[PDB]
RNA sequence: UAAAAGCUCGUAGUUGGAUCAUUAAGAGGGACGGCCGGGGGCAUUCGUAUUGCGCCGCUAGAGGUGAAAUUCUUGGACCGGCGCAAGACGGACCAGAGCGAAAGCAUUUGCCAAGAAUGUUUUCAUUAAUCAAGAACGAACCGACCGGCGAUGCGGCGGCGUUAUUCCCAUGACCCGCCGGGCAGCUUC
């Protein structure tokens, strides 16, 4: 059966980054998945996105530019400070210079910049480059 | 009686019913697998072989019809914890790695 | 076409299937 | 993806996906009600009691109009079934087939369904029982099984 | 079989012209797919439509026309041997059938050479023409191959047999020490 | 044998049929009947074939039609229809609705 | 491959695939009037039928179960609904 | 490029499949039923004006 | 020298949609509708060939081989005709088609149980996936790698026209477009 909807999401994004698409359809969609996409959006890596709702999970369209390199998840979840949070960038991230490791915290899900800036840490949720 | 004595007399006997000039040309071909040096493909017109390769593809697609009638790389992956399935597992000793 | 419904009563009008149709069986 | 089979069919159901009732539905809540009360009187099972009232008195769903499923409305009046649905039929099939096998002694073929039959049975019978819909004493037995339905 | 069709059709032209020597009719039914031979009465020798049936039954066997009319000649015979109910597996009948040819057909020419006769495999009937004694021999091996025993053995059989045909000495004499022994 | 080798071809289906049939003399009989399934004109499809039931369907009118039209007549009747087989006749014009024939014969 | 707005399918596309590939799902049936000869009552019945259906008023058979669509009497008249 | 060169070759069979299965539709097709549109106007979906 | 047999079920373990009780998953279970198949079991039945036996006709041979030789024959072999009995087998039609978990499955008809896919605005509501152990049966380059084009088998939908036609039995044969799950090809990413 199915283990992570936003794996499999991030995954079928993957896939069709590297066949060229230019719009990739996943579902079912979920308030993690819906967040995880803004944090990407934001730093342009997809673009515009749409949700569709029937009445069963919701299903999402994404558009594509090009840019993504590799998107994934992180399985343990360890739950990391913020003085630590260093050491997780650059054993993970090839480079110092982009990529971006997505963290869920108290405060909300949010990239490990933001991260520094509010001076908190939580549980990794995955990264892109 | 020995089948490996008897399988090459049988087959020269019958590679003379070919003809002498099919008798020669077989010849060359068992040769050459038993490691004999080939030899040399001549120099030909590349308009000349060009037409010579579009025949040879028609000549072998005619004779897939009448058969159903009967019927190194430069460099390595830059992206190869360990990753499957768009999942990244990372080993609770190796996370003690990262804190340290 | 009647006829083949009537064939096909015997399995569908069931006489045991429900809690009551146990409870006046039994009287 | 079918249990026992390797092909997977995609052949059911597809609601819509408006939930109101439509305009030219005559019919009222209450009015739906004793239709199933007749009819479950007569014997017949809640999936047949759809399938009649979508044939002929244009109930596309008894859930939009009444605002509760045909067991949920069977419970309430007391026309409660003994056993569920679902494991009944297949309780019923595994009598009948149990019964042919007493004489075909060498049909292999019945034999094997059998074992598929009474495995989705167990599946069935803890689930039913988690739910606390069984006792925690109900167990399936072939010489049983004849009494049971 | 249709595939026979398209070359029926040229050679029609000629087939009528050999059979109407010997003043035996011939039709060609595209609709129904089949070749006719029928006499008439100019003809005078009954024993000809028998080499008549015999050619058509060659022709849709794809044995070429000019191998097939010779037959109509008294000194050669025909027989058509039906090879695909020997064994119930196909993958094993196809395994037989490719060891009877052979590398590049050297045992099929080899069988050629030694029997004098015309042998052509086509399908599940292996066609062969020639002297009676010669067609004898083409039955025994191509069914023997069949039968799960090498042709090389055959083979290798009949060269000894033609030798010693050549020395005239023990004719009387019974051949078996000389014939190999597994 | 030369007439029953020529009918049978590779693309369609062969339906045979038999019954034992008394006639209203006494003389009892068993009579054999061969159909073959026909290409349409129009037809591109290459393969003619008749499903299971459609060939029951077929077997099954095969059989009336024969023990209809002798156990109601005598052998001299009998041997006046087999002469041009006007049984056969009868089975193709019946079986063309559910599928199409030729070449029938008794 | 052809280029498609996932987003905006055309008006041909939608009502060519299959029900549950759309983008919601949508039934391919539907609920009509029918009207028997005899009386003129009207009676409301299911396209894909699965029982024959009777008039109430004179009880004849209007349509017979099939593998897809209920096929109807001859002479009856039909309406699709809403 | 054989990249570009492969994705030239495969539309050309789409867009000639859908003809086959066009002109199969409007030569038995009674004429009424099929509207007809020109390949300019047909990506035209509403003008607003 | 950190130097260069199989196949299916299935226990433990592992692992499992969406929503803030709801929904009814292109998750799963069941029911219903018309079909479909060399799938399985029990009975029934036909067809040639072969062999043996009985009688009729005829008369010195028949069989086998490279050549012969074992054998059979005036008490009649072989050959021609008619009928009977026995053991197998099910051609051509027969396809890279279909069915079954695999091993495997082919004359007709009746009966018993089972099943895939398709159709569904029916029903339950997470009931699931993979599996050491255990249980049933068992001949004699690489990777779930998006797609496309043709045919092909079944089910369904729509359609200009041909072709038969329905007391019962039956509502089909052909052509075109479309949707699914299969058996396979050719290509691509
Ligand atoms: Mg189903
Ligand atoms: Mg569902
Ligand atoms: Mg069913
Ligand atoms: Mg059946
Ligand atoms: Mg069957
Ligand atoms: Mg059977
Ligand atoms: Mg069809
Ligand atoms: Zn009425």
């Known amino acids: 059966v199915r283990m992570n909807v936003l794996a499999d999401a991030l995954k079928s994004i993957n896939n069709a980054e590297k066949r060229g698409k230019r719009q990739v359809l996943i579902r079912p969609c979920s308030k993690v998945i819906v967040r995880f996409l803004t944090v990407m959006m934001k730093h342009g890596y997809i673009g515009e996105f749409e949700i569709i709702d029937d009445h069963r999970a919701g299903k999402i369209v994404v558009n594509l530019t090009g840019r993504l390199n590799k998107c994934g998840v992180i399985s343990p979840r360890f739950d990391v400070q913020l003085k630590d949070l260093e050491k997780?960038?650059?054993?993970?991230?090839?480079?110092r210079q982009f990529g971006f490791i997505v963290l869920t915290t108290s405060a909300g899900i949010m990239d490990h910049e933001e991260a520094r800036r509010k001076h908190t840490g939580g549980k990794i949720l995955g990264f892109f480059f | 009686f020995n089948l490996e004595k008897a399988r090459l007399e049988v087959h020269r006997f019958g590679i003379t019913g070919y003809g002498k000039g099919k008798e020669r040309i077989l010849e060359q071909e068992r040769?050459?697998?038993?490691?004999?040096?080939?030899?040399?493909?001549?120099?030909?017109?590349?308009?000349?072989?060009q037409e010579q390769i579009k025949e040879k593809?028609?000549?072998?697609?005619?004779?897939?019809?009448?058969?159903?009638?009967?019927?190194?790389?430069?460099?390595?992956?830059?992206?190869?914890?360990?990753?499957?399935?768009?999942?990244?597992?990372?080993?609770?000793?190796?996370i003690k790695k990262i804190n340290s | 076409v009647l006829e083949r419904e009537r064939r096909k009563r015997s399995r569908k009008e069931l006489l045991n299937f429900y809690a009551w149709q146990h409870r006046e069986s039994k009287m | 993806?079918?249990?026992?089979?390797?092909?997977?069919?995609?052949?059911?159901?597809?609601?819509?996906?408006?939930?109101?009732?439509?305009?030219?539905?005559?019919?009222?809540?209450?009015?739906?009600?004793?239709?199933?009360?007749?009819?479950?009187?007569?014997?017949?099972?809640?999936?047949?009691?759809?399938?009649?009232?979508?044939?002929?008195?244009?109930?596309?769903?008894?859930?939009?109009?009444?605002?509760?499923?045909?067991?949920?409305?069977?419970?309430?009046?007391?026309?409660?079934?003994?056993?569920?649905?679902?494991?009944?039929?297949?309780?019923?099939?595994?009598?009948?087939?149990?019964?042919?096998?007493?004489?075909?002694?060498?049909?292999?073929?019945?034999?094997?369904?059998?074992?598929?039959?009474e495995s989705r049975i167990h599946?069935?019978?803890?689930?039913?029982?988690?739910?606390?819909?069984?006792?925690?004493?109900?167990?399936?037995?072939?010489?049983?099984?004849?009494?049971?339905? | 079989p249709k595939y026979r069709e398209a070359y029926l059709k040229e050679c029609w032209p000629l087939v009528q012209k050999a059979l109407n020597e010997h003043h035996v009719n011939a039709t060609l039914?595209?609709?129904?797919?089949?070749?006719?031979?029928?006499?008439?009465?100019?003809?005078?020798?009954?024993?000809?439509?028998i080499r008549?049936?015999?050619?058509?039954?060659?022709?849709?066997?794809?044995?070429?026309?000019?191998?097939?009319?010779?037959?109509?000649?008294?000194?050669?015979?025909?027989?058509?041997?039906?090879?695909?109910?020997?064994?119930?597996?196909?993958?094993?009948?196809?395994?037989?059938?490719?060891?009877?040819?052979?590398?590049?057909?050297?045992?099929?020419?080899?069988?050629?050479?030694?029997?004098?006769?015309?042998?052509?495999?086509?399908?599940?009937?292996?066609?062969?023409?020639?002297?009676?004694?010669?067609?004898?021999?083409?039955?025994?091996?191509?069914?023997?191959?069949?039968?799960?025993?090498?042709?090389?053995?055959?083979?290798?059989?009949?060269?000894?047999?033609?030798e010693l045909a050549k020395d005239s000495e023990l004719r009387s004499q019974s051949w078996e020490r000389f014939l190999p022994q597994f | 044998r030369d007439k029953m080798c020529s009918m049978v071809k590779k693309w369609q289906t062969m339906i045979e049929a038999h019954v034992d049939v008394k006639t209203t003399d006494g003389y009892l009989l068993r009579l054999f009947c061969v159909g073959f399934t026909k290409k349409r004109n129009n037809q591109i499809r290459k393969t003619s074939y008749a499903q299971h039931q459609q060939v029951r369907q077929i077997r099954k009118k095969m059989m009336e039609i024969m023990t209809r039209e002798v156990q109601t007549n005598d052998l001299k009747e009998v041997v006046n229809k087999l002469i041009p087989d006007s049984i056969g006749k009868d089975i193709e014009k019946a079986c063309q609705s559910i599928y199409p024939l030729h070449d029938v014969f008794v | 491959?052809?280029?498609?707005?996932?987003?905006?399918?055309?008006?041909?596309?939608?009502?060519?695939?299959?029900?549950?590939?759309?983008?919601?799902?949508?039934?391919?049936?539907?609920?009509?009037?029918?009207?028997?000869?005899?009386?003129?009552?009207?009676?409301?019945?299911?396209?894909?039928?699965?029982?024959?259906?009777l008039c109430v008023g004179c009880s004849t058979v209007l349509c017979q179960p099939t593998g897809g669509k209920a096929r109807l009497t001859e002479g009856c008249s039909f309406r699709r609904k809403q | 490029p054989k990249s570009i060169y492969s994705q030239i070759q495969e539309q050309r069979i789409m867009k000639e499949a859908r003809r086959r299965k066009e002109v199969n539709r409007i030569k038995h097709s009674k004429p009424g039923s099929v509207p007809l549109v020109s390949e300019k106007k047909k990506h035209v979906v509403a003008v607003v004006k």
């Open chain 5, 29 to 49: 039914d595209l609709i129904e797919g089949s070749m006719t031979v029928c006499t008439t009465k100019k003809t005078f020798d009954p024993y000809i439509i």
């Open chain 1, 88 to 95: 997780w960038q650059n054993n993970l991230l090839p480079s």
């Open chain 4, 123 to 149: 599946r069935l019978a803890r689930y039913y029982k988690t739910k606390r819909v069984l006792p925690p004493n109900w167990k399936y037995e072939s010489s049983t099984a004849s009494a049971l339905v």
């Open chain 5, 52 to 162: 008549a049936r015999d050619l058509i039954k060659l022709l849709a066997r794809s044995v070429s026309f000019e191998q097939a009319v010779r037959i109509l000649q008294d000194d050669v015979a025909c027989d058509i041997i039906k090879i695909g109910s020997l064994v119930r597996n196909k993958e094993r009948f196809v395994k037989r059938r490719q060891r009877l040819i052979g590398p590049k057909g050297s045992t099929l020419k080899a069988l050629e050479l030694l029997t004098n006769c015309y042998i052509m495999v086509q399908g599940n009937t292996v066609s062969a023409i020639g002297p009676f004694s010669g067609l004898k021999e083409v039955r025994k091996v191509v069914l023997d191959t069949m039968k799960n025993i090498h042709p090389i053995y055959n083979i290798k059989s009949l060269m000894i047999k033609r």
């Open chain 2, 57 to 94: 593809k028609a000549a072998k697609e005619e004779e897939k019809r009448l058969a159903q009638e009967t019927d190194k790389k430069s460099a390595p992956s830059i992206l190869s914890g360990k990753f499957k399935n768009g999942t990244l597992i990372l080993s609770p000793v190796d």
């Open chain 2, 31 to 49: 040769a050459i697998m038993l490691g004999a040096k080939p030899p040399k493909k001549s120099y030909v017109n590349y308009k000349v072989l």
């Open chain 7, 1 to 53: 491959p052809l280029a498609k707005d996932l987003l905006h399918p055309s008006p041909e596309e939608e009502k060519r695939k299959h029900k549950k590939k759309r983008l919601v799902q949508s039934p391919n049936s539907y609920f009509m009037d029918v009207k028997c000869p005899g009386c003129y009552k009207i009676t409301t019945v299911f396209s894909h039928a699965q029982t024959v259906v």
């Open chain 4, 1 to 117: 993806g079918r249990m026992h089979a390797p092909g997977k069919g995609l052949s059911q159901s597809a609601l819509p996906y408006r939930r109101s009732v439509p305009t030219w539905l005559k019919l009222t809540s209450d009015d739906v009600k004793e239709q199933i009360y007749k009819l479950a009187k007569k014997g017949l099972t809640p999936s047949q009691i759809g399938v009649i009232l979508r044939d002929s008195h244009g109930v596309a769903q008894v859930r939009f109009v009444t605002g509760n499923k045909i067991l949920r409305i069977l419970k309430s009046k007391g026309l409660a079934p003994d056993l569920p649905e679902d494991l009944y039929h297949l309780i019923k099939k595994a009598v009948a087939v149990r019964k042919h096998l007493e004489r075909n002694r060498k049909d292999k073929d019945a034999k094997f369904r059998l074992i598929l039959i």
